[PDB]
Design an enzyme around this catalytic site. Structure first.
Site, PDB file in Angstrom:
ATOM      1  CG  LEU A   1      12.910 -12.544   2.176  1.00  0.00           C
ATOM      2  CD1 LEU A   1      12.533 -14.085   0.899  1.00  0.00           C
ATOM      3  CD2 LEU A   1      11.854 -11.657   2.198  1.00  0.00           C
ATOM      4  CG  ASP A   2      10.435 -11.271   8.319  1.00  0.00           C
ATOM      5  OD1 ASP A   2       9.951 -11.134   9.913  1.00  0.00           O
ATOM      6  OD2 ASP A   2      11.814 -10.960   8.327  1.00  0.00           O
TER       7      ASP A   2
END
Ligand SMILES: [Zn+2]
EC number: 5.4.99.25
Lengths: 51, 316, 119
Positions: free
Chosen positions: B73-74
């Site tokens: 996930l960013d």
RNA sequence: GAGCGUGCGGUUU
RNA sequence: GGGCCACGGAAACCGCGCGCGGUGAUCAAUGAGCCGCGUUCGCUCCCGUGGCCCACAA
């Protein structure tokens, strides 16, 4: 901005579940620090809610 | 609905096989230390940190030495980040391919009628192409639209960039668009449920266990690694085969007790004991119908062995 | 919510917004959860005010247990929007701590009386 | 070394 | 010879971002702008080193 019905689990921008009618809450988890400066105190508040 | 949601028939091969209770440790029988060595945390990543930092933290706080997360996930994005602890680490390779679900907040740059929006979003269900590769959109659902804001749920093949997807929607509508908010709600077998835990709960549960003596909440914080493999096709093996496959012996037909129907050659399959412990991960060398009718031959090339070699006797 | 370790009379909450309103343009207050907390830690906070609609709870929930450790009076107010406006800022504030009292020195002495009663 | 997983992008040995 | 498990196939510094400490603001106090200190996981195939096995499930 993104919110969630704690009962239905519905996602919404509104403050009232348009599914169930309950009050909605912010979908995101609280921001966390690896230093956790107030962990000592959160835990105190937390233990009471639990026993 | 994603592909992992398909119901699987269970074919029975040896109706008479039972399991010895004194061998192995079913998930809810593992002493908590052992529950961690083979543990998977279903983590709700906070806005801010990268997936890698979050994992460094966990390693520091719980005094672990191994731990890898699933689909990255960013920093800005939150939600389901499966985190595999210690000897469970590699099971992640079985999460990486499985499908994802997001709830996204797309903000338009122009004014578009609600009907155009929805009508157009729902063109994207199907195949898409993003800069040079081709991914899949399993479904798109538009929750609600406040003028220029469009909240929607989307279900995708792994490796699909939502940011990029949103852009293409911007262009299809003409006015352009940008992602103002993203949250992952499901990654393979990990959903938003009572197992989905924040960092605050997790580190607190840890200290209640370590400093208070109450191991209960921390045990709920951790799931058995068997969890990471719930979406996989399964073949269950007799006790007499278990130490052999944990030793790199490939699994022949005579060791099978029970399998899922629908298994095709090459498929990735979980190999389970009858206590529902994950023994190994491997690849089919037979379909499901072959494994059943047949009585001799290699049914599964064992490729990754998770179960320790001393849990079951060397019955050979 | 759960961090609210007690109820509060209607007329009592309006009292609190009166003091901070005063002790700003007159005395010396510190607004914002991060400042309010530093204050308690340093023990210069005379009375901590906590909004009731703070979401997520983890933002302000460390406060009531902190005040206990520091034996510093703390009260709740209905709204983080009005608590903000009542602190020389047009935003919102989840937490205020009057470091130094103004015209409301008595009105402040009055509130510790009614919180001690509510425990 | 070839890669993947969205998370990284630049100087050098 | 084959399988499985373990270790090895670099190191450093800068930048965004983020996080902490300080300050605390002309709709970000659930923290601006500035100053300082910090800060990033694993997996897959392939090749070496070593360990355990060679087990069609009795
Ligand atoms: Zn709900």
């Amino acid at each position: 901005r993104i919110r969630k019905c704690p009962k239905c689990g519905r996602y919404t921008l509104k403050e009232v579940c348009p599914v169930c009618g309950e009050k909605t809450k912010v979908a995101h988890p609280p921001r966390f620090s690896p230093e956790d400066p107030y962990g000592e105190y959160r835990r105190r508040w937390k233990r009471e809610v639990l026993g | 609905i994603l592909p992992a949601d398909i119901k699987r028939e269970v074919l029975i091969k040896d109706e008479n096989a039972e399991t010895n209770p004194d061998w192995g440790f079913p998930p809810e029988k593992r002493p908590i230390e052992m529950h961690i060595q083979f543990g998977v945390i279903n983590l709700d990543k906070p806005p801010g940190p990268t997936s890698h930092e979050v994992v460094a933290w966990i390693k520091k706080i719980l005094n672990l030495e191994k731990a890898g997360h699933g689909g990255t996930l960013d920093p800005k994005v939150s939600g389901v980040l499966p985190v595999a602890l210690e000897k469970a680490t590699r099971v992640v390779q079985a999460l990486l391919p499985a499908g994802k679900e997001y709830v996204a907040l797309m903000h338009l740059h122009g004014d578009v009628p609600e009907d155009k929006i929805i009508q157009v979003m729902k063109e994207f269900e199907g195949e898409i192409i993003q800069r040079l590769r081709t991914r899949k959109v399993y479904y798109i659902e538009v929750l609600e639209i406040e003028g220029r804001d469009v909240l929607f749920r989307v279900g995708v093949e792994a490796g699909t960039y939502i940011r990029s997807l949103i852009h293409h929607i911007g262009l299809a509508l003409g006015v352009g668009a940008h992602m103002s908010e993203l949250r992952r709600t499901r990654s393979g077998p990990f959903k938003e449920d009572e197992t989905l835990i924040t960092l605050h709960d997790l580190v607190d549960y840890y200290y209640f266990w370590k400093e208070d003596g109450i191991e209960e909440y921390f045990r709920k914080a951790i799931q058995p690694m068997e969890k990471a493999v719930e979406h996989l096709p399964k073949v269950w093996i007799k006790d007499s085969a278990v130490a052999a496959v944990t030793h790199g012996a490939d699994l022949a037909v005579p060791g099978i007790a029970k399998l899922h129907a629908g298994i095709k050659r090459g498929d990735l399959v979980a190999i389970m004991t009858l206590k529902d412990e994950l023994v190994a991960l491997g690849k089919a060398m037979m379909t499901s119908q072959e494994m059943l009718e047949k009585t001799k031959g290699i049914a599964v090339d064992v490729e990754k062995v998770f179960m320790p070699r001393d849990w079951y006797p060397k019955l050979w | 919510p759960s961090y609210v370790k007690f109820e509060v009379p209607k007329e009592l909450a309006e009292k609190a917004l009166q003091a901070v309103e005063i002790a700003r343009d007159t005395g010396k207050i510190r607004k914002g959860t991060n400042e309010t907390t530093k204050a308690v830690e340093r023990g210069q906070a005379k009375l901590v005010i906590i909004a009731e609609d703070v979401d997520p709870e983890e933002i302000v929930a460390h406060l009531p247990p902190l005040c206990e450790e520091k034996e510093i009076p703390y009260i709740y107010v209905p709204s983080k929007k009005e608590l903000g406006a009542a602190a020389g800022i047009e935003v919102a504030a989840a937490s205020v701590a009057i470091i130094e009292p103004g015209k409301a020195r008595d009105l402040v002495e009055e509130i510790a009386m009614k919180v001690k009663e509510l425990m």
